[PDB]
Design an enzyme around this catalytic site. Structure first.
Site, PDB file in Angstrom:
ATOM      1  N   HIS B  78       0.833  -1.202   0.000  1.00 50.11           N
ATOM      2  CA  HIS B  78       0.000   0.000   0.000  1.00 50.11           C
ATOM      3  C   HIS B  78       0.868   1.252   0.000  1.00 50.11           C
ATOM      4  O   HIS B  78       0.521   2.258  -0.621  1.00 50.11           O
ATOM      5  CB  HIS B  78      -0.903   0.002   1.229  1.00 50.11           C
ATOM      6  CG  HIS B  78      -1.806   1.196   1.319  1.00 50.11           C
ATOM      7  ND1 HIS B  78      -2.840   1.426   0.442  1.00 50.11           N
ATOM      8  CD2 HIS B  78      -1.829   2.217   2.212  1.00 50.11           C
ATOM      9  CE1 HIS B  78      -3.474   2.523   0.788  1.00 50.11           C
ATOM     10  NE2 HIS B  78      -2.879   3.026   1.854  1.00 50.11           N
ATOM     11  N   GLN B  80       3.863   1.436  -1.236  1.00 47.58           N
ATOM     12  CA  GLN B  80       4.460   1.498  -2.567  1.00 47.58           C
ATOM     13  C   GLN B  80       3.453   2.079  -3.562  1.00 47.58           C
ATOM     14  O   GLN B  80       3.823   2.792  -4.505  1.00 47.58           O
ATOM     15  CB  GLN B  80       4.920   0.111  -3.017  1.00 47.58           C
ATOM     16  CG  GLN B  80       6.164  -0.405  -2.269  1.00 47.58           C
ATOM     17  CD  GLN B  80       7.393   0.489  -2.437  1.00 47.58           C
ATOM     18  OE1 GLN B  80       7.650   1.016  -3.521  1.00 47.58           O
ATOM     19  NE2 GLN B  80       8.167   0.644  -1.369  1.00 47.58           N
ATOM     20  N   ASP B  81       2.176   1.769  -3.358  1.00 48.33           N
ATOM     21  CA  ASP B  81       1.121   2.293  -4.227  1.00 48.33           C
ATOM     22  C   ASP B  81       0.998   3.804  -4.039  1.00 48.33           C
ATOM     23  O   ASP B  81       0.853   4.552  -5.005  1.00 48.33           O
ATOM     24  CB  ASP B  81      -0.206   1.620  -3.905  1.00 48.33           C
ATOM     25  CG  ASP B  81      -0.322   0.217  -4.497  1.00 48.33           C
ATOM     26  OD1 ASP B  81       0.357  -0.121  -5.499  1.00 48.33           O
ATOM     27  OD2 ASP B  81      -1.135  -0.562  -3.954  1.00 48.33           O
ATOM     28  N   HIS B  82       1.058   4.235  -2.784  1.00 50.17           N
ATOM     29  CA  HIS B  82       0.982   5.647  -2.457  1.00 50.17           C
ATOM     30  C   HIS B  82       2.162   6.379  -3.080  1.00 50.17           C
ATOM     31  O   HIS B  82       1.996   7.379  -3.782  1.00 50.17           O
ATOM     32  CB  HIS B  82       1.015   5.830  -0.948  1.00 50.17           C
ATOM     33  CG  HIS B  82      -0.317   6.118  -0.359  1.00 50.17           C
ATOM     34  ND1 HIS B  82      -0.983   7.308  -0.581  1.00 50.17           N
ATOM     35  CD2 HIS B  82      -1.127   5.377   0.432  1.00 50.17           C
ATOM     36  CE1 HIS B  82      -2.141   7.283   0.043  1.00 50.17           C
ATOM     37  NE2 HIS B  82      -2.255   6.121   0.669  1.00 50.17           N
TER      38      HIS B  82
HETATM   39 MG   LIG Z   1       1.337  -2.095  -6.168  1.00 47.28          MG
END
Ligand SMILES: [Mg+2]
Lengths: 102, 102, 102
Positions: B78, B80-82
């Site tokens: 999460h 890394q997504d941010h």
């Molecule tokens: Mg990802």
């Protein structure tokens, strides 16, 4: 597949997503400078890089769907991040160029 | 490392990324209202928070690439997504500001 | 939960995010053509779908933070990528619509 296979494929994706990413940003630079011919050309090129490293995503997801246990890889996760954000830029770039074109 | 370490590092990346994003959004609100000066400075500030969160990225890839098995963490994923989505915003923000500045 | 369960929730996430994404992209097409009332309509609808997926995200992260071990799932990692890129677009759409509105 094993972790090492996932890691290598993740690296391939990081490479191609990265290339498509730079081309799309260079396209935005071209459009900013009123060079729309170059902007379009670049986007069209970035498109192939994405299509290549994307069709693999589909087969990968379908395998888990059909019962395959795919191993975790931070590299694969990272490549998917590059791929997915780059795809969003590709899906929205026409409007950015159009706005610069107007 | 263990899942606990990955999780905590994940929380760390989320915090930095979160702030970077808020500033980038705030920078957009500023450019929308003509406050380009405030928008520009805010963009510079965002970059610093990103440099922090982005730090551990290369190290993680290197560890796994050298054969080290890193644990899966939803929080890290999460984070890394941010980070990655925020970096894309940062990569495009300039053009949205310019379009507003024209 | 087990991987299979994690994969099922991921599919749900992909459905909500995929639908939301098409509405946001359609909202862009509308604005491009000057149909601003349609644009706002779609953005409002997309937010409803995003709220359902995002709320589900909060619970999951909280589960890990409270000590629970969650299985890795490619589909869930993919659903999150879709959701996260879609949330970014939703957070930036207003400015794109406004730019077309100017
Ligand atoms: Mg990802």
């Amino acid at each position: 597949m094993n972790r090492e296979e996932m890691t290598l494929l993740g690296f391939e994706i990081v490479a191609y997503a990265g290339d498509a990413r730079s081309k799309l940003l260079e396209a935005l630079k071209a459009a900013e400078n009123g060079d729309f011919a170059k902007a379009d050309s670049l986007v069209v090129e970035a498109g192939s890089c994405i299509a290549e490293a994307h069709s693999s995503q589909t087969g990968m997801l379908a395998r888990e769907a059909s019962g395959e246990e795919l191993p975790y890889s931070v590299t694969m996760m990272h490549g998917q991040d590059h791929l997915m954000t780059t795809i969003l830029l590709k899906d929205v770039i026409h409007h950015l160029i159009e706005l610069y074109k107007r």
